[PDB]
Design a protein around this nucleic acid. Structure first.
Lengths: 63, 47, 61, 60
DNA sequence: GTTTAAGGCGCGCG
DNA sequence: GTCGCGCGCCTTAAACC
């Protein structure tokens, strides 16, 4: 799918098996604003491709 | 998902709850596993 | 708030039986849904308001 | 109504660049987006405005 | 003193 | 008849610099 989803999918995959990160972390390490990051994460989520542990902030890993 | 599978079997307006149905449709389009070519009615199929 | 008690008395006013949707809660009170949900969600922070999830979410005490 | 015309008035009059977001229209006019967006998406189908895309969408 | 907040929001829906 | 809608989102207060 997308460039941005590409990059996000790279980073999460490389963290490890079950390692999870935040939109904030991603935002910093990819140089994109959090708004974009979240936009995509929530998409990939609705797409079954990722998993959100809900809280403050939510945690994102692969399902 | 239980009620998503059901719709797939068939293969666009279906006689079980029709509000709850459209949610599950656009989901699997956004989600994938379905095509949505525009016009009225919206047409649906496996890609 | 003026609306908070009003939102309360309306939920409160129509028994303990059931919650209602922000939509109608708006339409009857003549107040827009934006203002309504703001307050509902605001109140649900505090214990009185009680939110039962869905589309649309249902609001009771 | 009253609102359609003002909004309607706003675009050309303040045609600086081209177009603005429902949000801006709101803030200027002191009116929530619901009424505004109703009127914009309305004025589209029938022809007097163009939705140049984005999030939020822009109207000219 | 920016940034977060579920903050992702695009929504107009009768 | 298109309708998927869940939306509260700052007339912002708590929280991390």
């Amino acid at each position: 799918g997308s460039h941005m989803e590409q990059r996000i999918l790279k980073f999460l995959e490389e963290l490890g098996e079950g390692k999870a990160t935040t939109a904030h972390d991603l935002s910093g390490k990819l140089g994109t604003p959090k708004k974009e990051i979240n936009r995509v994460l929530y998409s990939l989520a609705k797409k079954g491709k990722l998993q959100k542990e809900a809280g403050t902030p939510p945690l994102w890993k692969i399902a | 998902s239980h009620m998503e599978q059901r719709i797939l079997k068939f293969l666009g307006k279906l006689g079980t709850p029709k509000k709850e149905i459209n949610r599950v449709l656009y989901s699997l389009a956004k989600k994938g596993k379905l095509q949505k070519e525009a016009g009225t009615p919206p047409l649906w199929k496996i890609a």
